[PDB]
Amino acid sequence: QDLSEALKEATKEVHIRAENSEFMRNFQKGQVSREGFKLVMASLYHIYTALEEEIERNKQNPVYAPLYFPEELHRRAALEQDMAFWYGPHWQEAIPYTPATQHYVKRLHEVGGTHPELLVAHAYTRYLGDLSGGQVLKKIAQKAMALPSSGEGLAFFTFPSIDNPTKFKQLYRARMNTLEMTPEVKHRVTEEAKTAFLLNIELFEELQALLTE
Numbered sequence: 001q002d003l004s005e006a007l008k009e010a011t012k013e014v015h016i017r018a019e020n021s022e023f024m025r026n027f028q029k030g031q032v033s034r035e036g037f038k039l040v041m042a043s044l045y046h047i048y049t050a051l052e053e054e055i056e057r058n059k060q061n062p063v064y065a066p067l068y069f070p071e072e073l074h075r076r077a078a079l080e081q082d083m084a085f086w087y088g089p090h091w092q093e094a095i096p097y098t099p100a101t102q103h104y105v106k107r108l109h110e111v112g113g114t115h116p117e118l119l120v121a122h123a124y125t126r127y128l129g130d131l132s133g134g135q136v137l138k139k140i141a142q143k144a145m146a147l148p149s150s151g152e153g154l155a156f157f158t159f160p161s162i163d164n165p166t167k168f169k170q171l172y173r174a175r176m177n178t179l180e181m182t183p184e185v186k187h188r189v190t191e192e193a194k195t196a197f198l199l200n201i202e203l204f205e206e207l208q209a210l211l212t213e
């Protein structure tokens with residue numbers, strides 16, 4: 001069984017749970033405020049910072065290297081424009097760093113430092129999602145929050161070096177299938193992908209509590 005297929009199978013059920021999180025329902029219903037959006041976006045800032053720092057540490061390692069697409073995928077410079085937009089010039093000393101965000105960053109550093117062969121799980125989970133449901137979330141954000149088509153505030157959702165997200169995703173899946181793959185690596189990669197989804201679910205449960213409690 002191809003890694004891309006194995007991953008899709010392993011994560012299809014938790015994906016259902018992820019897209020039907022309370023925070024995400026509210027999001028999809030058009031019920032998303034400036035405050036909430038700022039929270040989530042700050043949290044993603046720390047997360048992709050960690051992910052991308054670990055991608056860079058392992059860019060020449062053959063267990064990840066074929067998935068190394070900084071120009072097309074990396075989100076950090078984008079998230080920097082977005083933080084400046086949402087939090088202002090001094091956003092670096094403004095933005096929150098929640099405990100669930102930290103738990104996520106911490107795992108990212110463990111994977112990147114000790115188990116680089118799983119790093120694919122974490123890039124899969126985030127980047128492919130961004131190129132799928134992220135695109136739908138983007139249109140909802142624009143309508144709900146009156147964000148202009150020029151794109152300010154939504155750099156995270158914008159992939160100017162990818163012309164066709166669908167064909168790119170196909171390319172990425174195919175590449176995933178060229179990684180050296182043993183049963184031990186395949187099993188563990190698909191477990192880590194599930195953990196990645198859970199980390200995301202936990203982040204959203206925490207953001208939603210913060211918006212109420």
Ligand code: HEM
Binds near residue numbers: 126133134
């Ligand atoms: C309202 C929220 C969401 C919607 C509407 C949504 C929608 C989608 C749709 C329609 C696809 C299929 C596209 C294709 O086959 O190429 C997809 C794939 C994916 N999504 Fe989501 N999604 C949402 C949230 C999430 C979250 C929170 C994550 C991860 C944290 C995520 C990760 C992925 C991944 C990794 C894939 C690729 C599956 C694969 O083709 O192997 N999605 N999503």
